[PDB]
Structure formats: structure tokens, C-alpha cells
Amino acid sequence: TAEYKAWLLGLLRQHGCHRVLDVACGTGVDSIMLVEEGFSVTSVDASDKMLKYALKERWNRRKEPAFDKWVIEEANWLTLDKDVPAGDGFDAVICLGNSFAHLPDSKGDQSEHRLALKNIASMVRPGGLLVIDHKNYDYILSTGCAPPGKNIYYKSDLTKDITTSVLTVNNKAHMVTLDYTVQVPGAGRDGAPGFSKFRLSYYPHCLASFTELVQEAFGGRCQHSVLGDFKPYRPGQAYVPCYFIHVLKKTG
Amino acid sequence: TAEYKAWLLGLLRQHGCHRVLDVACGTGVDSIMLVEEGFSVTSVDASDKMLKYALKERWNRRKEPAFDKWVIEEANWLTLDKDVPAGDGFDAVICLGNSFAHLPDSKGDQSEHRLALKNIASMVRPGGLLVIDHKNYDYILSTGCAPPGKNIYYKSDLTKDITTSVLTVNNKAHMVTLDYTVQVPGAGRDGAPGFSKFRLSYYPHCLASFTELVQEAFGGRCQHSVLGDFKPYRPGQAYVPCYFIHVLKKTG
Amino acid sequence: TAEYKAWLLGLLRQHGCHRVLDVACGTGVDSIMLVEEGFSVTSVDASDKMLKYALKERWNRRKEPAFDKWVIEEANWLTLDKDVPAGDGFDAVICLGNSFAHLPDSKGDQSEHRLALKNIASMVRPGGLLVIDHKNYDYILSTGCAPPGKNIYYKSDLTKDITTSVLTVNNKAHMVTLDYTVQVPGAGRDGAPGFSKFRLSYYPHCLASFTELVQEAFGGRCQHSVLGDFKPYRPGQAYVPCYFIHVLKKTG
Amino acid sequence: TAEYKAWLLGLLRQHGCHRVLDVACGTGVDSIMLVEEGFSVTSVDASDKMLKYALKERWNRRKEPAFDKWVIEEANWLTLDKDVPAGDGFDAVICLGNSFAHLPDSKGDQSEHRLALKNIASMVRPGGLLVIDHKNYDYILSTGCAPPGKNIYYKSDLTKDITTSVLTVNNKAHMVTLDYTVQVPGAGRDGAPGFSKFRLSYYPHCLASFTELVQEAFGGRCQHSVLGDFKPYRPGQAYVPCYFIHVLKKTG
Ligand SMILES: Nc1ncnc2c1ncn2[C@@H]1O[C@H](CSCC[C@H](N)C(=O)O)[C@@H](O)[C@H]1O
Ligand SMILES: Nc1ncnc2c1ncn2[C@@H]1O[C@H](CSCC[C@H](N)C(=O)O)[C@@H](O)[C@H]1O
Ligand SMILES: Nc1ncnc2c1ncn2[C@@H]1O[C@H](CSCC[C@H](N)C(=O)O)[C@@H](O)[C@H]1O
Ligand SMILES: Nc1ncnc2c1ncn2[C@@H]1O[C@H](CSCC[C@H](N)C(=O)O)[C@@H](O)[C@H]1O
């Protein structure tokens, strides 16, 4: 989505951030872009399955200085330091795309989440930033299901029917499982579509908790700001952001 | 809970019931009772592991003319009919112990629960009682946790630790997986005890849904009365029940 | 085999054995028998499923004093001592039907086996008997295949196939998995029978190894002997047995 | 292997092979060599993990024009045809390193075998060459034990034990699973080494079968010849090889 792209860059540039570390390189979608707009991007992910693809584009677009100056290393927020040489601290550390909602709280104690963020944020240098984003589960929870479609991050052209299955654990949301029933265009007889599905689970983080979770990472020395979809967020605000974007100005 | 015993026995007598089909023998607890109580008790359960134990009680007291008659059989509510031929139906069909909750909503809709209940009622000869029962899920779904230890149904002697993990499919409380950890009076070392656990899931049956579900099965001709634990029960009261006992007098 | 029943009863009665412990009750065929013959028998088996099918005949024939004394309890050759108090001892402990072979050597060393044999021999009273047998896994070692329907115990009327997976660890036969492809003559449309299977895995056992392993169970004190099938066996003999039978007269 | 490498190049060379397809690119050891060696390499493996490492080297050496030409890709033999545009056919096609002995016969009939060899063979242009190798399983099988240390391919400086596990189905050698308990020079206390095993499963291919199986995919239209280790191998020859090397001059 144009807006998205716009928002991102404008922020990276509105701070002076040029050196960036992606902690969810995935397919390389956003990193690749950043690599175009002239950024020093070092992207990483823990899943080769995805990384391999990002790595793909590069080799091809290898006949371009921009793409020859791009990194892609595997890593896990659970040891981001051990896997990524922070140096003095990347200008901006970006983790947009509700990537963090993939970290399931295994131990029951949100020990997994603190640690992850701890390492993630650490890589940000003084006067640094962190574009960590998560879906609006506060609502998803209060709704009972997950409203698909409006990907303020991308204008999805494919349609699929979602089936939301939340799982309370001792009264605390422990996970949200989205069951996508994709309706591929043509996969039948006289042209009719085919029905192929896939599902994935995440953690139902709620603004409140994440906000506190995030600061806790920067040891406190930081500037916190949260945008509803892509614009600032004001409690009890007429709107209803699909996404929640938390940006951190590591100050100390 | 001795009390429990008194009330039920009476209802049975006050209504001149003798032949009693127990659609949930479990370990034999109730049947054993009616047994001694002097009732032609034909108890059946769907579990080999459980029945195994009610059977044992029989062999031992096989010497007792009473128990020699008692009859435990395998069977499933989902097919009771074929598995249990009730000549002209029985006098009292009990389903005590929150056993009916175990029946999971596989197909999504409550179709399964239909056949189950549907079949159970059929086991009641016109002018016959039934005592199905379910944990107060209305209140349980608000506390999102299952209070263990006491069950007015009886008083065992096993201290347990529980972990209530509820599930919500598209906002509808689908399942409720309770994880127990029973303390074994002897499993440590120097007298120390053991701690062996297991896990059972149930279907959160709200008083509402069930009363309608149950009567449904009787096609209509019947008398319904739901007592909280075991005393009368009228909506929005001061007392909070842990178990809702549904007593029915099929009349057609 | 009426000839193998005549010998079993002959040997037992011959040595004056009344008390007999079937350490492999199973459905209880072999045990059930001894019972009818006015023999005092306690029957134990490690498998509920099977044991229970015997427990059944007891209730049924419970109307016969004999079965009113017949016993059955779950038990494992590995914890025998604790599951079955031997008291003074049993006159004749039997382990027919290639049951023992079902104990796998998980640990690698016959340790498990020694404990098994050891525990069973501890159920015999000085001047005792033990009828443990084992299929002729010696020839099967040179034929890498086990032919079905050769039981010299009960006429098998269930047509079935079999696939033999002989495992060999470090040149030492370690396992033998027989995948039974039974047929259900009636599982079909116009009478046609259906087809499926169940798995059964046993540890091989060539005469030598077992001939010694077993004596050790009594540790010398014993008059051991092994009939080819049910007749006197002789190494380098003509008739190739198929069921070696070790009879033990604990002497000490 | 000083020897290995030697023979190869020469062979390839003498035949005049330029473009080579490695159907088992693994970590890309032989691919990277031929690359440097000045050969038009197109290598592929069916395993991300493996491949992903060959890819890495290429990215680093990406500078040197050689690796710039290299062509690592994903692909599985079973469908190698619709995975690699045979084009005008390759000059040489290597499948060395006991890689083929990895493809199992889940189907029961070595069908999946004949096909893989077939598709692979299809990547060989007329006057072509095929270098498919495999362990001397004849010996292992006939000896029930797989010898450790004789890796003619590359002198292994490792100290791990080997537990050869041959599996049998209906009298046919279905699988050979070796357990290599490799010893980490340093994993103990006082500078001691540690221990960690790892078992792998290969299909016990015997020369007779293989030799047959190979020319088939060819259709008798070739010139087959198998080396002992790297020298002429004749039946009965006192020397017991370890790696049979089949070379095919697909002459058709
Ligand atoms: N513990 C963790 N640390 C770092 N990366 C992780 C991770 N857990 C999951 N990931 C990876 O992050 C990726 C999912 S993020 C999905 C959104 C995607 N990046 C987008 O732009 O639309 C996967 O490749 C997953 O392997
Ligand atoms: N669908 C079904 N049909 C018949 N019996 C069932 C059943 N679902 C559950 N049950 C039975 O419910 C019985 C007792 S209720 C479960 C409680 C358990 N016996 C305890 O001691 O804690 C079990 O024997 C179980 O097999
Ligand atoms: N560890 C063990 N301890 C006790 N019984 C065992 C055992 N391992 C296997 N068994 C039992 O071996 C039994 C009999 S095997 C076949 C028995 C058959 N009815 C006959 O003709 O004798 C099975 O019931 C199985 O439960
Ligand atoms: N079905 C198949 N298709 C393609 N490649 C295969 C294959 N089965 C296994 N392989 C691959 O071959 C490699 C193992 S064989 C390489 C072993 C070599 N001797 C060494 O020690 O270096 C792995 O990449 C595996 O993924």
C-alpha cells in the first residue's frame, strides 16, 4: 500500500535513520524496498523457508549495487544479540507486520516476550527507533472473531474466509488461531475456483500490555508513541485501528 | 455428599421406580448404591478402563445376591439404542456426574448432542424419570476456571490441582479442557506421596441451552425441574450452584 | 490340541500340582481350562483388553463353583513379585502360547529378560513346575518369514495374511514384527469380506539362548526339559519343531 | 579425496564434458570444485537446508565470475524432469556420494527407484555420462555390519562408533540404518570429549540390482561400467571395495 510505504520511509527519514536492522525479514518485502530507497539494510529472520525467498530476489537483483549491499542472516529474538553484531546500534530496528504476534508464550510466564524484545530493542542505537507493530487484539478479543480484508499494509487481491478460534488459559488470552479458507480463482471445472486453506496462530497482545512490554525493554530510557492504523492513537477515539504501531526512540 | 444420596433415593421411591438404567456407570458409584438400595440396576458406560472397576466391585460382592443381578455393559449415548434394548423402557434413567458434558461438539452445531440426549430419553418408559446433570458453566465461563475438590455428588478423598483452559470458536465457548494433577497418598519416598495427572475436556453447557436441549429429546410430553446443587432453583438467585440436576418425568 | 491338553493336564496331575498360576491368562483359554478340570488357578495378565475377555467367562460361568474361585488380576512379569504375592509358592506356573516372546529387549542387554524370567520362577514352590514356551525362532531365523495358522493349541478359523519385518542390530537379531492382515468374510456388499490388519511384535529366541536364560531364572535348582513341539526334542533331529516347550522342575 | 578428485576431473575431462548437472548438490562440495575446475555447473538438491549452504558459498564468492555462473536450485529426482529443463541434455551428470541410497521404497516395489534413475538418466545427452554411486551394501548385508572409517570419498578425521541396523520385510532387505555415535574431541570434564549419536537410513542397494536398475532407465542404450573404489572392479577380486561407482555413456 502506497500509504504504508510512504509512512515508513518518511519516518525513517524524519529521524535521520539510515542504517536499519529488520528482525522479521520474512520474504524481504519491506527490507527490499528500504534497500531501494537507499538504506543500509541488514535483514534477518529465523525461518529459512521464508529467508530463502528474500535471498532469491537479491541474487537476481544482484546486478545492482543497492542489492549487493544488503544482508540476510537467520536469527531469533530469543538470542538476537548472539546472532546479530549490534556494533554501536542500528539507526532504526523495524519489526512491522504483526511479526511479534508469532512469538507464542511457551513458559506461561511472558518471560519469552520480555527476552525477545530485550534483544530486539537492544540493537537500536541512542536516539534510535523501533517500529514494532501488532494487530488490534484488544478488539479481536472483544469481538470474538478476526475481521480480515483490510490490510492497511497491503491491498490484498485474494479473498479467503477466516475462522477465528481464541483460547483462554486460566482466564488470560493465550492465543488466537486464524483459519484461512482461501478461495483460489480458478480450480474447478468450467472455470470455477478451488478451495485451499491454511492456518496460523499468534498471541492476542493488547495495547495496554504491549505498551508496558515495549518500554520495559528499553530499560525505560526511551520515547514511546503509538499510532492507530497509521495515525496517532487517542484512547476512546471514534476510530478503530486495524493495526497498532508502536515506535520507540531509544534515548538511553 | 451423603445428602445427595437421600434426596435421589426418595424421588426414585416416591415415584415407584425399580428398574434404573445408568447411562454412565463410571466406576459404579451410583449404580452400586441403587444396587444395595434394592434396585434392578442396569448400568452401562462407554469406557473399558472405567467399567473395569465397577465390574470388580461386582465380583467381590458377587456373593451378595443383590450384586449378582447388577449389570454393567459397554455402550455409547451416540448409539445407546442399538446397544441397549429397553423392552418397554425403564423406570429411572440416571446420567449423574457431569458425564454428559464429555460429549464434544465435533460437527460444530449441536447435532451430536441431539442424538445423545435424544437416545437417552428413549430409555425412559412413559411416566419415567431421568437425572442428567451438568456443571454450572454459566458461572464457570465468567470465572474462566473450574473450582475442584467438592462435588455434592459424593466425597472422594483425592486432592487435586487443576488448570482450566477454555476455548472460544467464533465467540462461542466451544470446549473447556481441564488439566488435573491428583495427589497419590503414597508415591514419594519416606511416606512422601506421588503426583500423577491427566486431562479431560468438556462442553460448556449453559443451563439455558441444556433445558431446551433436554426437553427437546422428550419431544415435549414431559416434566422438567432443574435444582441447583439439589434444592430448588429459580433464576437470578442469591445462591450459586456448582451442578445443575435435571429431573424429568417423560409423560408421552 | 487335545493331545497337548492331555499332556499338560497329565504333567500337572502327574506331579501332583493343584495350585497353578497362569502368567499369561490372555483371553484366558488355557486358564479357563485348568479351572474346569478341578484345578485351583489364579490367572494374571498384563493387558486389560485381553484379560477382561476372560473376566467375562467368569461372571457368565460364575454359576459354577469352579469359576467362583477362579482368579484374574492384571500383572507384569517385570513387577510380578510386587503384583502377585507368591506366599509359600505355587505348585505349577505356566507360560504357554509364545507369550513371553512379547517382552522386548529395550535395554539392549537381556537384563529385562532376566528380570522377567526371574520374577516368574519366583512363583514356583520347591519341587515346582514352569511351562514357558517360545516359537521355533531358530528356523524362522534361516527362513526370514513366519507361516501363520500353525498353532498347535486352538483351531484358528480367521483367515489372515502376515508380513515379517526382522530387525537385526549389529548382526544380532533384535526384533520380529508380524503385521497381521486379517480378513472379515462378512465385511462387504454381497457377502464379500473386507480386509485390514493389526500389529504384533516379538523378540526372537533360539533354543540355546533361552534354554540357558531360563534355567538361570532358577539358578541351577531345576530339572529343565524342552519338547520339540509337544514331543521329545533332539538336537540334529528330523522333525523340525515349531513351538519349543520348556518344562521346569525347580529343585532347590 | 586426493584420489577421488583426481580420477573425476580426468574422467569427466577425457569424455569432454563441460556442463554438468549435480542431482545431489548437498552442501555443494563437488559442485564448488567443478566450478573452480572450470566447468559449466548447474547443481541442485532436494533439500533446502543442504542447498542453502551451497548457496551461501556462492554468494561470498559471488564476486569471482566463476561462481557467478554457478546454478544451485531445488529439485527432487522423483520429478527431476518437470524440475530441470533438460534442454539439449547435460554432458556429465554426477550423483556421487551415496546420495541415491537415500531415496526409500515406500511403495514396496522399487518403482520409485527405477523412476528416479530414469528421470536422472533423462538429464544425460547422447554420448552422455552418468556418475551414480552407492555403498557396497552387498558386504554390509552379507556381514550384518557396516564398517566405519573407510570413506574413500574423504578421509574422515572423526571418531564415532557405528551400529548397523538391517531391517527385513518378507525376506527382502528393506532398509539399513547406521547409528554413528560420533565423539566430540572435547565434551568431557578434564579436557575430555563428549558423545552424541546420529543415525541415518539408506536403501541397501546391491551391485547386481543397481547395475540392472541403472541401465534400465537408459533402455539398454548406453555403456555401463562400475569401479571398485576408483579402479577396475572384477567379481571375486580379493579386494572388498566400499563405494561402487557406476558410469554411463548414454549412447542413444
Ligand atoms: N522468534 C522469532 N524471531 C525472529 N523471527 C521470527 C521469530 N519467530 C518468527 N519469526 C519469523 O518471522 C517471519 C514471520 S513475519 C510475517 C510478516 C511478514 N514479515 C510480512 O512482511 O508480511 C517468519 O519468517 C518467521 O520465521
Ligand atoms: N459419549 C459417551 N458415552 C458413554 N459414556 C461416556 C461418554 N462420554 C463420557 N462417558 C463416560 O463418562 C464416565 C464417567 S464421567 C467422567 C468422570 C470419571 N469417571 C472420573 O472418575 O473422574 C466415563 O466412564 C466415560 O467413559
Ligand atoms: N510384560 C508382560 N507381563 C504380563 N503379560 C504380558 C506381558 N507382555 C505381554 N503380556 C501379555 O501376553 C498375553 C497373551 S499372548 C496370547 C495369549 C493367548 N490367549 C494364548 O493362547 O495363551 C497378552 O494378553 C499380553 O497382554
Ligand atoms: N530424494 C532426493 N532428491 C534430491 N536430493 C536428495 C534426495 N534425497 C536426499 N537428497 C539430498 O542429498 C544430500 C545427502 S547425500 C550427501 C552426503 C555426502 N557423502 C556428504 O557426506 O557430504 C542431502 O542434500 C539430501 O537432501
Short mmCIF file of C-alpha atoms and ligand atoms in Angstrom, two decimals, chain D residues 23 26 45-47 50 75-77 97 99 102, ligand 4:
data_model
loop_
_atom_site.label_atom_id
_atom_site.label_comp_id
_atom_site.label_asym_id
_atom_site.label_seq_id
_atom_site.Cartn_x
_atom_site.Cartn_y
_atom_site.Cartn_z
CA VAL D 23 21.49 -34.08 -8.95
CA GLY D 26 24.20 -31.32 -0.97
CA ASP D 45 19.47 -30.78 -4.33
CA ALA D 46 16.02 -31.67 -2.98
CA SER D 47 16.75 -30.26 0.48
CA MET D 50 21.66 -28.70 2.39
CA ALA D 75 14.64 -30.20 -7.24
CA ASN D 76 13.78 -33.80 -6.44
CA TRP D 77 14.71 -36.81 -8.56
CA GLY D 97 28.29 -39.70 -2.51
CA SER D 99 23.05 -39.99 -2.18
CA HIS D 102 18.74 -42.17 0.42
N1 LIG E 4 15.18 -37.52 -3.00
C1 LIG E 4 16.23 -36.72 -3.13
N2 LIG E 4 16.27 -35.77 -4.07
C2 LIG E 4 17.27 -34.90 -4.12
N3 LIG E 4 18.28 -34.88 -3.26
C3 LIG E 4 18.31 -35.78 -2.27
C4 LIG E 4 17.30 -36.71 -2.25
N4 LIG E 4 17.31 -37.41 -1.13
C5 LIG E 4 18.36 -36.92 -0.45
N5 LIG E 4 18.96 -35.93 -1.13
C6 LIG E 4 19.98 -34.99 -0.59
O1 LIG E 4 21.35 -35.44 -0.63
C7 LIG E 4 22.09 -34.94 0.48
C8 LIG E 4 22.62 -36.11 1.29
S1 LIG E 4 23.83 -37.11 0.38
C9 LIG E 4 25.36 -36.21 0.72
C10 LIG E 4 26.34 -36.99 1.60
C11 LIG E 4 27.82 -36.75 1.26
N6 LIG E 4 28.52 -38.05 1.06
C12 LIG E 4 28.49 -35.96 2.39
O2 LIG E 4 28.72 -36.55 3.47
O3 LIG E 4 28.79 -34.77 2.17
C13 LIG E 4 21.08 -34.05 1.18
O4 LIG E 4 21.04 -32.80 0.50
C14 LIG E 4 19.74 -34.64 0.86
O5 LIG E 4 18.82 -33.55 0.94
#
